[PDB]
Design a protein around this motif. Structure first.
Motif, PDB file in Angstrom:
ATOM      1  N   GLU A 129      16.630  22.614  15.667  1.00 45.81           N
ATOM      2  CA  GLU A 129      15.281  22.638  16.231  1.00 45.81           C
ATOM      3  C   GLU A 129      14.809  24.071  16.401  1.00 45.81           C
ATOM      4  N   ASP A 130      13.833  24.459  15.614  1.00 48.92           N
ATOM      5  CA  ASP A 130      12.990  25.608  15.890  1.00 48.92           C
ATOM      6  C   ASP A 130      11.603  25.031  16.081  1.00 48.92           C
ATOM      7  N   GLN A 131      10.592  25.859  16.181  1.00 46.22           N
ATOM      8  CA  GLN A 131       9.346  25.172  16.495  1.00 46.22           C
ATOM      9  C   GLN A 131       8.486  25.033  15.262  1.00 46.22           C
ATOM     10  N   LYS A 170       7.854  23.260  11.171  1.00 45.98           N
ATOM     11  CA  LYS A 170       8.089  22.226  10.180  1.00 45.98           C
ATOM     12  C   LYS A 170       9.034  22.750   9.099  1.00 45.98           C
ATOM     13  N   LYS A 171       9.986  21.916   8.708  1.00 47.56           N
ATOM     14  CA  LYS A 171      11.023  22.353   7.790  1.00 47.56           C
ATOM     15  C   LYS A 171      11.043  21.410   6.606  1.00 47.56           C
ATOM     16  N   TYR A 207      15.118  19.769   7.371  1.00 48.82           N
ATOM     17  CA  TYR A 207      15.077  18.535   8.135  1.00 48.82           C
ATOM     18  C   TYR A 207      15.740  17.493   7.241  1.00 48.82           C
ATOM     19  N   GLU A 211       7.849  15.742  14.075  1.00 51.31           N
ATOM     20  CA  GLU A 211       6.906  16.848  14.141  1.00 51.31           C
ATOM     21  C   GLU A 211       7.461  18.101  13.480  1.00 51.31           C
ATOM     22  N   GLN A 212       8.785  18.204  13.354  1.00 48.44           N
ATOM     23  CA  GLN A 212       9.440  19.344  12.729  1.00 48.44           C
ATOM     24  C   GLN A 212       9.818  19.073  11.285  1.00 48.44           C
ATOM     25  N   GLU A 229       8.419  18.775   7.408  1.00 45.16           N
ATOM     26  CA  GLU A 229       7.316  19.194   6.561  1.00 45.16           C
ATOM     27  C   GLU A 229       7.246  18.200   5.418  1.00 45.16           C
TER      28      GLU A 229
END
Length: 252
Positions: free
Chosen positions: A26-28, A30-31, A62, A112-113, A115
């Motif tokens: 978790e970073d803030q 989209k991956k 993700y 939400e993270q 992409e």
């Protein structure tokens, strides 16, 4: 440097379901998304799948991996006819359509993270083929990698016989690979069944546009049969190659 795994369950028709995990650091942000289809003898916790998911999550992705719904069918005590029916390529495409739908609709954990503008597929053994098919039929799949799979679906299983019989056109992955504009990487270990190496050569002839890598001294599973006590040189090469491939075809 913390890798969260978040379980989820998609409920399907009758009493069918798909169990899976989102694996993510978790970073803030989209991956890019990696969706992993396991092999027809495999399952989401077998062997290197936990390791592979975590490996990619550590390296910017993700990651979604899941059990095909036939796996939950077997584990729920379904009779052999039903598992046989749920073991078709059509069933795999349909299960894959449940997973991508829930991801794109942001229903999976931590979505939400994710992409969803950069989705790749990774398939093993025959999921390599069904993933190529699904990619060819869907515009939002930007790239696909097959590990020791990819040639067209070719039994004790009559349902598979009927399915391949009624989808000769649809599942011809040599045709699909030749016409598909999205990048496809096929990794094949050299120490593997002869029929698959011949089908792999057929595919490479049909679609020389795509990418074909051979790991010469590697078995059908890169030596990552269960349990997963440690990685192997062949698995680490498969991973580093798949990562380089998605990398280069991201900024292109």
């Amino acid at each position: 440097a913390v890798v969260v795994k978040k379980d989820f369950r998609i409920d399907l028709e009758n009493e069918l379901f798909i169990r899976g995990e989102v694996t993510l650091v978790e970073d803030q942000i989209k991956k890019p998304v990696l969706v992993i289809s396991h092999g027809f003898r495999g399952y989401k916790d077998w062997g290197f799948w936990p390791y592979v998911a975590a490996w990619f999550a550590e390296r910017g992705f993700y990651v979604v991996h899941f059990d095909f719904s036939r796996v939950g069918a077997l584990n729920s005590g379904a009779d052999e006819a039903s598992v046989q029916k749920l073991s078709t390529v059509s069933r795999e495409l349909s299960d894959l359509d449940a997973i991508l739908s829930n991801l794109r609709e942001h229903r999976l954990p931590l979505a939400e993270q994710a992409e969803t503008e950069r989705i790749s597929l990774l398939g093993h053994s025959r999921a390599g083929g069904s993933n190529i098919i699904f990619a060819a039929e869907h515009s939002y799949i930007g790239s696909v990698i097959a590990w020791n799979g990819g040639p067209p679906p070719k039994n004790p299983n009559p349902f598979i016989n009927d399915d391949v019989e009624h989808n000769k056109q649809r599942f011809d992955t040599a045709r699909l690979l030749a016409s598909l504009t999205a990048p496809v990487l096929i990794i094949q270990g050299g120490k593997d069944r002869e029929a698959l190496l011949e089908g792999q050569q057929l595919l490479k002839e049909a679609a020389p546009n795509q990418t074909y890598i051979s790991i010469p001294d590697a078995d059908h599973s890169f030596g990552g049969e269960h349990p997963f006590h440690h990685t192997t040189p062949y698995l680490e090469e498969a991973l580093e190659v798949t990562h380089s491939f998605i990398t280069k075809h991201y900024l292109e």
